Structure 1
Amino acid sequence: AQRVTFRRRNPYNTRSNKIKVVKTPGGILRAQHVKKLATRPKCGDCGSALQGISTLRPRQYATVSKTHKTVSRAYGGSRCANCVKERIIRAFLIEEQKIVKKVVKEQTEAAK
């Protein structure tokens, strides 16, 4: 039934100051200051957590390699695979329909 202390000088139960109680090699209970939890990166289009990317705080994303932060696809760490698929399809298709819209007016005014 050992009781613990905040090991720093901030006494208040703030988000910055969460603790986990941990038993040490001395046998005692001690408080251990845990950092805030890391939130996953999201796709700009859908807003959903996008897999293959490591979960960290923003300054810890500068310690690690590219592959913890990117998938090998175009729009890797930024857009979901499905969003990418959708915009590929949209791109190709409405480019083709722009061609079609062009030749339509071309032959129209050529007729008149």
Structure 2
Amino acid sequence: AQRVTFRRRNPYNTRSNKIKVVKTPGGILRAQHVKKLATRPKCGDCGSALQGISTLRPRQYATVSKTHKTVSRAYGGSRCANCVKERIIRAFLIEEQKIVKKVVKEQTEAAK
């Protein structure tokens, strides 16, 4: 049966003026301004949120340690950990294909 007011000068229900009702140690209801929630980082080509990376605001990523923003595997904090393994098959097979196509070209001018 207790009502509460805004704690700042903004009187409108914008996206940056969310309110959570919090019971204080004084025994009364009081509003608390909450921040906009962070979004998990996404992979560069598959669109899924890669795991092992903390979900924070971009400028508070410079305060957390190194281990919260990367994975020990190469292309750690950029790819989907199946995106890495997909471009290894492609990098190994094409270069193996590019050298067996070079010896097929050699077959032409050496026997015509």
TM-score range, shorter chain: over 0.9
CA distance in 2, matches of 1:59, 1:2: 37
Which residue is equivalent to 1:28?
Answer: 28
1:8, distance to aligned residue in structure 2 (A): 0.3
CA distance in 1, matches of 2:94, 2:74: 20
Which residue is equivalent to 2:43?
Answer: 43
Question: Unpaired runs of 5+ in structure 2?
Answer: none
Which residue is equivalent to 1:86?
Answer: 86
Match status 1:18 vs 2:18:
yes
1:66, distance to aligned residue in structure 2 (A): 1.0
CA distance in 2, matches of 1:31, 1:110: 85
CA distance in 1, matches of 2:71, 2:28: 45
1:81, distance to aligned residue in structure 2 (A): 0.5
Calculate the TM-score normalised by the size of structure 1: 0.97
Say which SS state the counterpart of residue 110 (structure 2) adopts: helix
1:73, distance to aligned residue in structure 2 (A): 0.8
Relative to its length, the structure with more helix (as a share) is 1
Say which SS state the counterpart of residue 21 (structure 1) adopts: strand
1:111, distance to aligned residue in structure 2 (A): 1.3
1:79, distance to aligned residue in structure 2 (A): 0.4
Residue deviations 1:70-95 (CA, integer Å, cap 9, x gap): 01111111001100000011000001
Which consecutive segments of 4 or more residues in structure 1 shift more than 3 A? none
CA distance in 2, matches of 1:52, 1:92: 27
1:107, distance to aligned residue in structure 2 (A): 1.9
1:40, distance to aligned residue in structure 2 (A): 0.4
Calculate the TM-score normalised by the size of structure 2: 0.97
Residue deviations 1:28-80 (CA, integer Å, cap 9, x gap): 11000000000000000101100000001100100001110001111111001
How many residues align? The count is 112
CA distance in 2, matches of 1:74, 1:68: 15
CA distance in 2, matches of 1:63, 1:21: 29
Question: Unpaired runs of 5+ in structure 1?
Answer: none
RMSD between superposed Cα atoms in Å: 0.7
